[PDB]
Amino acid sequence: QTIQPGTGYNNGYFYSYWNDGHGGVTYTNGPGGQFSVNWSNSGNFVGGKGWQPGTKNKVINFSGSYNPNGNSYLSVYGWSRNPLIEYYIVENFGTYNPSTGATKLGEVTSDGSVYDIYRTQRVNQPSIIGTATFYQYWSVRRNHRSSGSVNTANHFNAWAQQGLTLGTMDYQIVAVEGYFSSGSASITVS
């Protein structure tokens, strides 16, 4: 069903939906691992389905339609504690590459494409533990797709070779993020 921002479990899967209160976004939880997001001249938002807690070796499958009309990303998104890390394994994006301004650390081949690895630090930003300072890890896919399988272990291993050391895994979802744009998406996770 269509809901306001919040988290919980739906049809067997953890979900998380958040927005900056700007308006223009409609998040709906669907059957099984499906969720749909329709937005128009929105603010900043993030919505998706997955697991709580996630793992370091989960193979995530997703399929559906992703039609961004501007700034938006489709990715495996999550957090880690001790160390506190926010991460993204970007599979597709609209008009703006999310790694713009980040520091490239290397590359990794996984699930049919090379991914460029980046890192950025967020100082005194909101997080799963409140206002804190943490790193943000990125894996950006060169060959964009809206359907496939992501072997998280390949990315976590690659990041570990570059100095990352994920601790306790918090949530892990396939999320659609929008930033003052429009679009529609219907993704099913499994």
Curated annotation (Swiss-Prot):
Subcellular location field: Secreted
Could you tell me which pathway this protein works in? Answer: Glycan degradation; xylan degradation
Q: Tell me a GO biological process for this protein.
A: xylan catabolic process
What are the record keywords, sorted? Carbohydrate metabolism, Glycoprotein, Glycosidase, Hydrolase, Polysaccharide degradation, Pyrrolidone carboxylic acid, Secreted, Signal, Xylan degradation
Q: Which family does it belong to?
A: Belongs to the glycosyl hydrolase 11 (cellulase G) family.
EC class name: hydrolase
Q: How does activity depend on pH?
A: Optimum pH is 4.5-5.5. Stable from pH 3.0 to 8.5 at room temperature and from pH 4.0 to 7.5 at 40 degrees Celsius.
Chief localization: secreted
The conditions that induce or repress this protein are given as: Induced by D-xylose, dependent on the cellulase and xylanase regulator xyr1. Repressed by glucose through negative regulation by the crabon catabolite repressor cre1.
- The GH11 domain is annotated at 2-189
Give the protein's recorded name.
Endo-1,4-beta-xylanase 2
**Protein EC:** 3.2.1.8
List the record's Gene Ontology CC terms alphabetically.
extracellular region
Q: Which organism is it from?
A: Hypocrea jecorina (strain ATCC 56765 / BCRC 32924 / NRRL 11460 / Rut C-30) (Trichoderma reesei)
Q: Which residues are glycosylated?
A: 38, 61
Q: What does this protein do?
A: Glycoside hydrolase involved in the hydrolysis of xylan, a major plant cell wall hemicellulose made up of 1,4-beta-linked D-xylopyranose residues. Catalyzes the endohydrolysis of the main-chain 1,4-beta-glycosidic bonds connecting the xylose subunits yielding various xylooligosaccharides and xylose. The catalysis proceeds by a double-displacement reaction mechanism with a putative covalent glycosyl-enzyme intermediate, with retention of the anomeric configuration. Produces xylobiose and xylose as the main degradation products.
